[PDB]
Design a protein around this ligand. Structure first.
Ligand SMILES: CO[C@@H]1O[C@H](CO)[C@@H](O[C@@H]2O[C@H](CO)[C@@H](S[C@@H]3O[C@H](CO)[C@@H](O[C@@H]4O[C@H](CO)[C@@H](O)[C@H](O)[C@H]4O)[C@H](O)[C@H]3O)[C@H](O)[C@H]2O)[C@H](O)[C@H]1O
Length: 293
């Protein structure tokens, strides 16, 4: 059955959006709307192996106390973002493996939804063949280790419908053992329509023995900006998409989620915009305004 049905997704009471919504004077409807929508909590190399277990146990335990499903995004892969606007990640594969062990220690047997490494499989071609195989081994390590929590619903990130082909991405998912996980994620931090991503997801599902998937609908209410380089990097005219739900329109779509947090910058984007991940109230307000809120 769908592991994501049956309780609400957790609203992070300390998100940057919630801090902005509480500080707004006077109160701002757009920030309040975004703040009260469940998103995902992103972890990276800022949370070292030595302590990330406690961070994860705290978050999953808080979600359980709220009667809710936490969604965690792991974004620590070595050579993260191929050294671009969201550069980061752990220095070596050894470090990353230790990090994954620690995350799993903190999960225990607790309910969680885990989005494994946005962009890692899709962007792997920037790496040399040996670095690419290393990366695939690290993603496989994450799948094999994280799924030891029976209550973790694990989705390996698989890019989007305008990145790799369904066949190319299914090959990579099969190589990292997607069969052991619940499935894969699409559209993370991007803007493609839900309908387009369902078609792509169903294709990949067919090529991975019926795996299930989630779609990031955080910013896809108006579809993508016109085809141009960097059209994914803080584009204007985008809108919040469908709020998180398991009432989806795809046979193997477990949920629409907000994986990317609306309002966070995608990067400097060749325009001196805020560093990747920094919350910008104006960005959240514009996304909500464009959705008619
Ligand atoms: C001169 O060299 C050529 O440059 C052009 C333009 O840069 C290259 O073409 C672009 O190739 C891309 C494949 O690498 C694709 S798909 C496009 O890929 C980028 C990554 O390169 C993706 O960006 C990432 O998007 C994520 C969100 O979905 C972010 O989280 C992440 O930080 C981004 O880096 C993007 O989503 C994909 O759509 C282009 O369509 C193409 O224009 C060309 O290959 C070079 O030879």
């Amino acid at each position: 059955a769908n592991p994501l049905a049956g309780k609400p997704f957790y609203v992070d009471p300390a998100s940057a959006a919630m801090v902005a919504a509480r500080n707004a004077n006077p109160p701002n409807a757009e920030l309040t709307s975004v703040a009260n929508t469940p998103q995902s909590y992103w972890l990276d190399q800022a949370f070292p192996p030595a302590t990330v277990g406690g961070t994860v146990a705290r978050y999953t335990g808080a979600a359980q106390a709220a009667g809710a499903m936490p969604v965690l995004t792991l974004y620590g892969i070595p050579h993260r973002d191929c050294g671009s606007y969201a550069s980061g990640g752990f220095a070596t594969g050894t470090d990353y493996r230790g990090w994954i062990d620690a995350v799993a220690s903190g999960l225990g047997s607790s309910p969680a939804t885990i989005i494994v490494e946005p962009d890692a499989l899709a962007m792997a071609d920037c790496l040399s063949p040996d670095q690419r195989q290393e990366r695939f081994d690290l993603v496989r390590y994450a799948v094999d280790t994280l799924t030891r929590d029976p209550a973790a619903a694990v989705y390996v990130d698989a890019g989007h419908s305008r990145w790799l082909s369904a066949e190319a991405m299914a090959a990579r998912l099969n190589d990292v053992g997607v069969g052991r996980a619940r499935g894969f994620s699409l559209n993370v931090s991007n803007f493609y329509t839900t309908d387009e991503e369902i078609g792509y997801g169903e294709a990949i599902s067919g090529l991975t023995n019926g795996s299930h998937y989630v779609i990031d609908t955080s910013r896809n209410g108006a579809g993508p900006a016109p085809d141009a380089p960097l059209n994914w990097c803080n584009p204007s005219g985008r809108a919040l998409g469908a709020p998180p739900t398991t009432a989806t329109a795809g046979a193997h779509a477990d949920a629409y989620l907000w994986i990317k947090r609306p309002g966070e910058s995608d990067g400097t984007c060749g325009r001196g915009e805020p560093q990747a991940g920094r919350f910008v109230s104006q960005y959240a307000i514009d996304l909500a305004h464009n959705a008619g809120q």
